Write a protein that holds these residues in place. Structure first.
Motif, short mmCIF file in Angstrom:
data_model
loop_
_atom_site.label_atom_id
_atom_site.label_comp_id
_atom_site.label_asym_id
_atom_site.label_seq_id
_atom_site.Cartn_x
_atom_site.Cartn_y
_atom_site.Cartn_z
N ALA A 104 20.73 -14.24 -56.33
CA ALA A 104 22.29 -14.00 -56.92
C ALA A 104 23.29 -13.27 -55.78
O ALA A 104 24.13 -13.82 -55.80
N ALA A 105 23.13 -12.00 -55.03
CA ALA A 105 23.85 -11.14 -54.14
C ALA A 105 25.09 -12.89 -53.42
O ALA A 105 25.85 -12.06 -53.27
N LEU A 106 24.11 -13.14 -52.91
CA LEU A 106 23.90 -14.38 -52.05
C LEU A 106 24.62 -15.64 -52.53
O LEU A 106 25.48 -16.59 -52.09
N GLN A 113 28.40 -9.02 -58.65
CA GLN A 113 27.84 -8.81 -57.30
C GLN A 113 28.16 -7.85 -56.98
O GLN A 113 28.29 -6.80 -55.98
N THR A 114 29.00 -6.91 -56.98
CA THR A 114 29.62 -5.47 -56.86
C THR A 114 28.19 -4.69 -57.06
O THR A 114 27.77 -3.33 -56.01
N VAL A 115 28.11 -4.95 -58.37
CA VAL A 115 27.02 -4.64 -58.53
C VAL A 115 25.70 -4.30 -57.91
O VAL A 115 24.76 -3.39 -57.71
N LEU A 116 25.60 -5.74 -57.88
CA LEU A 116 24.28 -6.24 -56.87
C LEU A 116 24.15 -5.10 -55.41
O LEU A 116 23.49 -5.02 -55.17
N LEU A 171 21.63 -10.93 -44.23
CA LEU A 171 22.43 -9.90 -43.46
C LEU A 171 23.52 -10.35 -43.44
O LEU A 171 25.03 -9.91 -43.09
N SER A 172 23.39 -11.22 -42.63
CA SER A 172 25.06 -11.64 -41.85
C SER A 172 25.57 -13.37 -43.23
O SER A 172 26.46 -12.87 -43.26
N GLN A 173 24.71 -13.44 -43.61
CA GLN A 173 25.23 -14.30 -44.76
C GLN A 173 26.42 -13.63 -45.81
O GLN A 173 27.34 -13.70 -46.66
N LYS A 214 13.52 -11.13 -54.09
CA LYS A 214 13.96 -12.04 -54.08
C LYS A 214 14.82 -12.82 -54.48
O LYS A 214 16.33 -13.02 -54.37
N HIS A 215 14.86 -12.66 -56.09
CA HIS A 215 16.37 -14.02 -57.01
C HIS A 215 17.72 -12.88 -56.80
O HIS A 215 18.55 -13.33 -57.16
#
Lengths: 1322, 270
Positions: free
Chosen positions: A111-113, A125-128, A204-206, A106-107
């Motif tokens: 973070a990726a969002l 963000q690319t690594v995530l 997913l949409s976000q 969840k965390h």
């Protein structure tokens, strides 16, 4: 930094440390901030951390919700990425401690969002995104699936537009109630649980919206940081992976379609940037290919052409209705049928002139976007709506035509492209635009396309390499002409090339059906090269290159620099040699042409020729077929890429009729146990295992969990048939008497003597039963024995069936033939295919079978003449097969029928008085004891005579076909019952088999863990379907998934796409039940324990546990197994005399000294094998042997000095293994290669390597701790064998602690033996 | 003996056609016989829809040699006829349009025969939601002065009206309206544009200008394109003056001076 990270590991998390300081989150924070973030995500630093067990020892076990932070989650994600890029298990730690895994996921999602460039950078963000792609690709693990379920479920449709969701519910009414239930479920949850569920459902949409905003953030020509490009590539790759997975695609397809990300990525200037966005363009093309694949996400089944046309026509009809009802300007478009406006051209012509507001209103009426408010203008570009509507309503081409429109050759734009043909230096930080196959596939079309494209791209690397080698050796220089300053072995200067045939292509297809060209080369080379060039035959792959050199003559060529500009590479095209022409103009007792010119006919790619002609016609290009100046040939054993690709294209163009119980299994989904014998409705109850069990005690003991009930009580009455129930754990065992085969006691059929265990009995039973049977056999588990028993049982129980034997190499086929030769198998029904050195006592090839059939037919004709003479039939004429059958049915059948009516319609004397074959059997009958016995003896004589007549009738075809090839075809199609071959030979000749009509009922394959996936699928379609169904009845595959996998030339395709994944390994990974042989029968138990921990109950057979030769210690050696730590020698540890040719002088010299000692002590040098971890190390050992022993009489030569990868399936009595690498553990970390290197020794294994570097290796710890349970210094007994392994030696125990001391001891012993002995080898 | 068992097998299969295809395969795979192959092909075509009729049709349209098809016929069109009869409504696996329409489009060599068969095959093969417009575009590309195009338009109009007796009913109403707008005036115009164009016929030029009136004036541009480089035999000034008087109704300003500036450098003998 390396010393700091190493001290940090040794203090906080390093293994081999009894006590470490307590956990500290400041340690992880400082490590992340200074080593990962500071070093720009250093691959070396991440690798050092991952090898130090940082996640498994400090991060994961000490992760808690109160201590989870951005640095901790980023370190965990980077460690997982390093484990995945290194191809090691990354989720074992998460499975051991799944407590905080949901909070961690969840965390990570939170973070990726995160908004781009905020607390988390674009690199984080690319690594995530890569971590999320790996997790969505890790759908087999329960812990990750239970968390990804909420973000990939149908409730995620709450992210789609309300109008689109309503349209989906109207299209699928049965789903509407389901959604209602979901809404009801949302009522039962507290506010926080509902908020978390909604966040997961909209994640997913976000992420799609964040990717779209990042994609818009890229300038057209202005300088852009690569971080946005890498993030876009990773996001596209994750989307492609999700769209290729049915469990992830089922609901994600509708969200992606509602998002219109494909239109944006097609409209973004990033794809317009020729340099930065090329790989992103390939990824977007793949994503479009996946988003338009003809498969129904709800049903999962592939859509036919009718369904695709109906969907397109329904879309067109909805658009026409919307236009006619809401847009007068498109009323004619509403009046005209689909096709008239269903072209992209018609759609642009009708819709392009309309305004952005009109296209927006159409998209609102087509459920594509929000309704445009009255008096409002659209805020999206007119090009956006125009491209969206055109791509939605324009005509689309089929995948079959898209594959068929592809040439079979890679050209000059593909041979050098690292985006699809990555070099051997591919580290894995960037992405590659090639599919990956891990667990499942969309359909058979998806699997076949992935395999064929991957095979082409994998062969392209070797093709480009060899082409560069030939052109660089050729020395192409300028002089406006090209001058060859050197020579190349496989490349010849083009003397002439002229396309002589452009056949009219079949209609519908727009390409020529066949293009031919005559190419003349100048055979002005050494006669060896002349023969090597003259040895090219039909099917040869030759490459025409046109190079326009730029450097003047005599300019040095540089292999390190770009070869393309260095030699002037212009064009590279492929062709298939159809044949060499003679002095009579005919493509060809081969003739001997005169002169130094050689003319060959070649077939050119019709698709590539069509592309070149179209480009020349439309864009004014120069004639590519008139510029070729060089022709390159290659090794035929490495030039089968085109044949495999053609087999792939054909097997994708046929209906692909596989067994109904095997389609889902191959596809990677469904019940993995749907192909077992117990789940097959066509299971046989009573099966004849006559020669499987040697005795009734072995039969009963082969089923510990079964109660044996015999149909006879007499212990003298216990060939056995086993009937199974379907209380219910009782097997009905019936003893039988094999029918007498004549008066010749030597004609009694042989029996197998291998006392099979219960696991082997279950494997043989599963093989004798219909379905798919997977056998997991450890090294020396009797795989050949169980295979031969299954094949014999199948041939004996079903004589009307045919068995196809598939191997990986010729060695397995030779071993299978040698194993069959000891059983009751008539040699007239066995056939061996291949395009080789004979390894068998008999000839199983086509020619050997033809000669044997002819000799047996001669013997049968002679025996028929003798029988006629013994019956009193006059006539000196020699008989043929047809006349033999006539004479049989006239005299022998008649006399047998009369005698049977006489004695079988009954005295013991009259049974012999009425025998009509007394004179025929006078060379060999009746006992006069009981009627039954004499009747059985007469029946056996008649059975022998009937066998003679049947063999003659079968061989008559040899007189019906004079040519040897026709005889081999007749034997392979009808006469033979068991045909064996390799996976490569089958993949090459599958078309020939299907065309000639070869059929089979059972398939038995060995070494399936060494066959490529396509190489395992290719044997299943070696014949046509039978009346709409596949004729295959049983599919047995035996191998070792813990052993070495298939070889991938350029390791990038294995690091990225996992192309080395075998079909057997994948089927095991799905969960298919396999029978694990757990009894080895070739090597000592102490040595087998070094690899038995990796097998399922891999034990020791009785013979190895009680046999005396396995308990005798090694002469001159204290222990049968020793690991030798080799420190640095003269300041060097590992070495690199050549790039990647690693060697270790001290370890190699120590192995040489150990071999010298074993030789001087009296050990057979041939019984000792040398294995090394690198080819350079093997070569160093070879050179050292050549320089140290040479012509020394007391020291012979070892059996093999090679690598562990080249010693597969082989073994010796004693093995000296070299782990030379000391800086990195390297490819030894693969558990399969470790098990292979530790499972190659029969009695003695001596390893020389750095113990410490490998003891820090987690994957090898189960063997490394047992190897370190003994000292790391050589304990020898130079004063000596009959010593017991456990009995203390009665000699001197010498402790050599170093390689120099071992060499000194060897020198002293040799100087003493040369004065005390003298060998006379000459 | 086989020449007596195979006819005996075909005569014995007169009550149950189970082994007829098997004897046909044993005779065709063990004997090269064109008359027997044609008899067995008619035997498998005596089935329901495509029971081994498709296999014999494919083996008869394969035509590797030239002796088997020339057994009891020599027209080089019976194989195309059989491919079109296979393209008929049947119950074969797919056999939809590919090889049959492909060959009938590349090597037709028969006026309105392969075109009409291909239009019908795209008309009723399976539903034909998009294949109908396929046949319509095929008729729009290749017409060759034949009435197969108008027949295909009538077939397109037919089905939606029949279904009604509603958006497809209006589609069929518009299709019939276009077929009525396909009056033979365009046919006579195409006749005057095919044959008398190279003949340097000013009568065909006036008929072409008459068929292209001043209400579809892009068709007056087509008439100027007909007056363009393909010249006449001693009468190009009349066509150019007609074009000038037409452009004078088009404002008398644009394309008026430029055309006369081109006509001052068209002083060729033509």
């Amino acid at each position: 930094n390396a010393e700091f990270v190493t001290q940090l590991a040794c203090k906080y998390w390093a293994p081999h440390i009894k006590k470490k300081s307590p956990f500290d989150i400041k340690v992880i924070e400082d490590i992340y901030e200074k080593e990962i973030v500071k070093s720009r995500f250093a691959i070396r630093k991440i690798m050092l951390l991952e090898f130090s067990q940082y996640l498994e020892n400090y991060l994961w076990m000490n992760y808690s919700p109160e201590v989870s932070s951005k640095a901790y989650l980023m370190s965990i994600c980077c460690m997982v990425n390093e484990k995945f890029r290194e191809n090691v298990p990354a989720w074992e730690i998460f499975k051991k401690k799944p407590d905080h895994f949901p909070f961690f996921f969840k965390h990570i999602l939170k973070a990726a969002l995160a908004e781009t460039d905020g607390e988390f950078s674009l690199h984080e963000q690319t690594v995530l995104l890569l971590f999320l792609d790996h997790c969505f690709n890790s759908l087999e693990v329960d812990l990750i699936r239970s968390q990804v379920q909420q973000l990939i479920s149908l409730p995620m449709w709450m992210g789609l537009q309300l109008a689109r969701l309503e349209l989906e519910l109207k299209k699928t009414p049965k789903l509407r109630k389901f959604w209602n239930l979901i809404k009801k479920n949302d009522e039962k949850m507290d506010p926080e649980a509902r908020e978390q569920a909604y966040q997961e459902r909209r994640f997913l949409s976000q992420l799609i919206q964040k990717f779209i905003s990042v994609l818009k953030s890229v300038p057209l020509s202005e300088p852009v940081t690569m971080d946005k490009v890498h993030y876009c590539e990773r996001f596209i790759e994750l989307m492609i992976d999700l769209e290729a997975l049915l469990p992830t695609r089922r609901w994600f397809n509708t969200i992606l379609d509602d998002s219109h990300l494909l239109v944006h990525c097609y409209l973004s200037n990033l794809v317009r940037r020729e340099e930065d966005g090329h790989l992103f363009s390939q990824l977007l093309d793949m994503l479009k290919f996946y988003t338009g694949f003809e498969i129904n996400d709800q049903t999962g089944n592939a859509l036919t052409e009718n369904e695709m046309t109906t969907i397109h026509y329904d879309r067109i009809t909805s658009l026409q209705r919307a236009a006619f009802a809401h847009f007068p300007e498109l009323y004619d478009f509403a009046l005209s049928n689909v096709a008239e406006v269903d072209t992209r051209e018609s759609l642009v012509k009708f819709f392009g002139p309309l305004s952005s507001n009109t296209l927006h209103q159409v998209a609102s009426y087509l459920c594509l976007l929000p309704t445009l408010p009255k008096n409002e203008d659209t805020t999206f570009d007119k090009e956006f709506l125009l491209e969206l509507l055109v791509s939605r309503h324009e005509r689309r081409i089929s995948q079959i035509q898209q594959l068929n429109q592809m040439p079979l050759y890679p050209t000059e734009k593909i041979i050098w492209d690292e985006n699809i043909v990555p070099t051997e230096y591919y580290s894995g930080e960037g992405c590659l635009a090639l599919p990956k196959l891990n667990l499942q596939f969309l359909t058979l079309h998806d699997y076949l396309l992935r395999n064929f494209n991957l095979f082409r791209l994998e062969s392209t690397y070797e093709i480009r390499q060899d082409i560069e080698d030939s052109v660089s050796r050729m020395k192409p220089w300028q002089s406006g002409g090209v001058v060859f300053g050197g020579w190349a072995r496989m490349a010849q200067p083009i003397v002439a090339f002229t396309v002589v045939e452009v056949a009219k292509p079949n209609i519908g297809e727009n390409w020529p059906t066949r293009v031919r060209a005559d190419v003349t080369i100048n055979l002005n080379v050494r006669d060896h090269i002349k023969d090597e060039w003259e040895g090219l035959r039909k099917h040869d792959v030759c490459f025409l290159i046109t190079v326009r050199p730029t450097k003047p003559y005599g300019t040095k060529f540089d292999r390190r620099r770009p070869f393309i500009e260095q030699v002037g590479l212009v064009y590279v095209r492929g062709c298939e040699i159809q044949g060499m022409l003679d002095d009579k103009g005919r493509v060809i007792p081969r003739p001997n042409l005169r002169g130094e010119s050689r003319t060959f006919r070649v077939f050119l790619d019709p698709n590539q020729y069509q592309q070149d002609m179209t480009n020349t016609i439309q864009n004014g290009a120069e004639d590519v077929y008139e510029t070729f100046n060089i022709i390159m040939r290659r090794k035929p054993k490495e030039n089968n890429f085109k044949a495999v690709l053609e087999t792939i294209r054909n097997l994708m163009n046929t209906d692909c009729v596989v067994p109904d119980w095997l389609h889902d299994i191959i596809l990677g989904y469904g019940d993995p146990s749907s192909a077992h014998y117990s789940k097959m409705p066509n299971q046989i109850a009573t099966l004849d295992f006559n020669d499987t069990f040697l005795s009734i005690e072995h039969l009963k003991a082969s089923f510990p969990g079964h109660n044996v009930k015999v149909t006879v009580e007499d212990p003298a009455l216990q060939p056995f048939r086993i009937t199974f129930p379907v209380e219910a754990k009782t097997l009905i065992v019936e003893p039988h008497v094999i029918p007498n085969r004549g008066p010749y006691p030597y004609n009694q059929p042989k029996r197998n003597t291998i006392q099979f265990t219960h696991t082997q009995i279950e494997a043989i039973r599963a093989g004798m039963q219909p379905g798919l049977t997977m056998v997991v056999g450890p090294p020396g588990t009797g795989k050949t024995d169980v295979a031969v028993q299954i094949i014999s049982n199948i041939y004996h129980n079903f004589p009307e069936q045919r068995t196809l034997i598939v191997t990986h190499s010729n060695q397995a086929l030779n071993q299978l033939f040698e194993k069959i030769m000891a059983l009751d198998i008539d040699e007239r029904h066995l056939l061996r295919l291949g395009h080789e050195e004979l390894e068998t006592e008999k000839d199983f090839s086509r020619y050997g079978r033809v000669n044997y059939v002819l000799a047996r037919r001669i013997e049968l004709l002679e025996e028929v003449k003798r029988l006629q003479k013994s019956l009193g039939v006059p006539g000196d004429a020699s008989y043929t097969c047809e006349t033999a059958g006539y004479f049989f049915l006239y005299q022998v059948m008649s006399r047998w029928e009369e005698y049977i009516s006489k004695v079988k319609n009954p005295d013991v004397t009259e049974v012999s008085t009425f025998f009509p074959f007394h004179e025929y059997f006078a060379n060999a009958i009746f006992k006069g004891r009981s009627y039954e016995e004499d009747m059985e003896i007469a029946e056996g004589c008649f059975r022998h005579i009937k066998k003679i007549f049947t063999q003659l009738e079968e061989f008559r075809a040899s007189e019906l076909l004079r040519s040897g090839l026709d005889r081999s075809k007749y034997l392979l199609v009808k006469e033979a019952k068991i045909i064996a071959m390799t996976c490569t030979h089958a993949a090459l000749k599958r078309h020939d088999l299907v065309k000639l009509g070869f059929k089979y009922d059972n398939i038995l394959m060995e070494e399936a863990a060494q066959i490529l996936e396509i190489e395992t699928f290719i044997p299943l379609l070696l014949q046509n379907p039978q009346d709409g169904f596949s004729r295959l009845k049983r599919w047995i595959m035996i191998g070792d998934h813990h052993q070495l996998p298939p070889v991938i030339k350029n390791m990038a395709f294995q690091k990225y796409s996992n192309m080395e994944q075998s079909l057997f390994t994948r089927f095991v990974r799905v969960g298919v039940p396999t029978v694990d042989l757990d009894a080895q029968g070739r090597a000592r138990a102490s040595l087998c324990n070094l690899y038995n921990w990796r097998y399922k109950n891999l034990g020791n057979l009785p013979h190895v546990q009680l046999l005396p030769e396995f308990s005798t210690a090694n002469a001159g050696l204290l222990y049968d197994f020793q690991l030798i730590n080799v420190e640095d020698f003269q300041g060097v540890g590992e070495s690199e005399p050549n790039p990647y040719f690693y060697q270790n002088l001290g370890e190699a010299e120590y192995v040489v000294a150990l071999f010298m000692y074993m030789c001087l002590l009296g050990y057979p040098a041939d019984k000792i094998s040398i294995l090394t971890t690198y080819n350079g190390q093997k070569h160093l050992i070879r050179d050292i042997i050549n320089r140290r022993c040479g012509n020394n009489p007391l020291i012979g030569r070892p059996n093999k000095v090679t690598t562990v990868d080249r010693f597969q399936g082989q073994q010796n009595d004693y093995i000296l293994l070299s782990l030379v690498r000391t800086r990195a553990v390297g490819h030894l970390r693969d558990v399969r290669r470790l098990v292979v290197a530790m499972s190659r020794a029969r009695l003695g294994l001596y390893i020389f390597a750095r113990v410490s570097l490998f003891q820090n290796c987690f994957e090898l710890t189960p063997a490394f701790s047992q190897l370190t349970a003994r000292p790391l210094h050589l304990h020898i007994i130079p004063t000596e064998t009959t010593r017991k392994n456990g009995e203390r030696p009665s000699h001197e125990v010498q402790i050599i602690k170093n390689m120099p001391q071992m060499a000194n001891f060897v020198y002293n012993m040799y100087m003493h033996l040369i004065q005390t002995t003298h060998h006379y080898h000459q | 003996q086989h020449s007596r068992i195979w006819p005996l097998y075909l005569r014995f299969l007169r009550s149950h056609p189970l082994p007829e295809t098997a004897v046909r395969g044993y005779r065709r795979f063990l004997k090269l016989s064109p008359e027997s192959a044609e008899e067995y092909i008619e035997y498998l075509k005596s089935s329901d829809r495509l029971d081994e009729a498709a296999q014999r049709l494919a083996t008869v349209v394969n035509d590797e040699r030239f002796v088997s098809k020339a057994g009891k016929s020599n027209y080089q069109l019976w194989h195309e006829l059989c491919d079109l009869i296979s393209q008929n409504p049947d119950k074969v696996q797919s056999l939809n349009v590919d090889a049959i329409i492909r060959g009938g489009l590349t090597r037709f060599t028969d006026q309105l025969g392969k075109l009409w068969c291909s239009l019908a095959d795209y008309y009723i093969r399976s539903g034909h939601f998009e294949k109908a417009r396929d046949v319509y575009e095929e008729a729009i590309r290749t017409v060759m002065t034949v009435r197969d195009f108008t027949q295909v338009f009538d077939s397109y109009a037919q089905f939606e009206e029949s279904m009604i007796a509603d958006v497809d009913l209006e589609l069929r109403l518009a299709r019939f309206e276009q077929l009525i707008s396909r009056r033979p005036l365009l046919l006579n115009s195409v006749l005057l544009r095919q044959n008398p164009h190279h003949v340097h016929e000013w009568h065909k030029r006036v008929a072409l200008h008459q068929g292209r009136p001043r209400e579809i004036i892009n068709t007056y541009t087509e008439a100027v394109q007909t007056v363009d480089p393909f010249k006449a035999t001693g009468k190009p000034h009349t066509l150019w003056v007609a074009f000038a008087k037409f452009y004078e109704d088009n404002g008398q300003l644009d394309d008026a001076r430029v055309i006369l500036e081109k006509a001052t450098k068209v002083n060729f003998k033509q």
